[PDB]
């Protein structure tokens, strides 16, 4: 329920529907609409947003958070984590990693994405 | 922090000094010693320990926890994360990862360990 969680979901709802309803934010984050209203005011005072609209500041952060999430899902998928486990692991770790780690994981994903033989060799290890 | 953070540090202190003083735990986790005393009583209720002595259940968990920490450090090191950032990243993510992710990270570490050309090739993508 951090500021980052809220901005992440808000950004996504705007990308999905064109707007972010309080009730949609509430559902997405499994919190009561009261909590949502509280966070909105803080987000507004810290100028992440102004229905509700993200400032360029909020947009940059939202875009980054969605990037981080997708990257980390891709990372765990590539290394062979059971698909069903991936979402909860990503949600758990995404806010705790330094940009340095995100970027190195980014490079690692790129490393596997550029020659399928590498993915096959990784798979071979798991077999042992 | 969590029960796991406590068990990790307690197991470490026993490995290092032969015993775990409340004051050493408090210092290790940067928490108030009053918090420790209360946390210790809970670990006792859940039979992770009984001075402070880990039960077989507590020793098994502690060994796993230390293993998890070390593996995750190796992982971030191998993919080239700045050394100074590694510890804080590991502390943040370690109790949020499923065993499946840990074990796949283990396989990934093994992948890089068994052929140095893989490390070299990864170092090259970083230069792009
Ligand atoms: Co996420
Ligand atoms: Co640790």
Curated annotation (Swiss-Prot), chains A, B:
Annotated control of activity: DNA binding is strongly activated by Mn(2+) and Cd(2+), but it is poorly activated by non-cognate metal cations, including Co(2+), Fe(2+), Ni(2+), Ca(2+) and Zn(2+). In the strict absence of divalent transition metal ions, MntR has a low affinity for DNA.
Binding, Cd(2+) 1: 5, 91, 94-95
InterPro entries: DtxR_MntR_Metal-Reg, Fe_dep_repressor, Fe_dep_repressor_sf, HTH_DTXR, HTH_tscrpt_reg_MntR, Iron_dep_repressor, WH-like_DNA-bd_sf, WH_DNA-bd_sf
Disruption phenotype: Null mutant is very sensitive to manganese. Mutant also displays increased sensitivity to cadmium.
Occurrences of domain HTH dtxR-type (ranges): 1-55
One annotated Gene Ontology cellular component of this protein: cytoplasm
One GO molecular-function entry: DNA-binding transcription factor activity
Statement: the UniProt record of this protein carries the keyword Transcription: yes
PANTHER family attached to this UniProt entry: IRON (METAL) DEPENDENT REPRESSOR, DTXR FAMILY, TRANSCRIPTIONAL REGULATOR MNTR
Protein name, UniProt field: HTH-type transcriptional regulator MntR
Top-level taxonomy: Bacteria, Bacillati, Bacillota, Bacilli, Bacillales
Gene: mntR
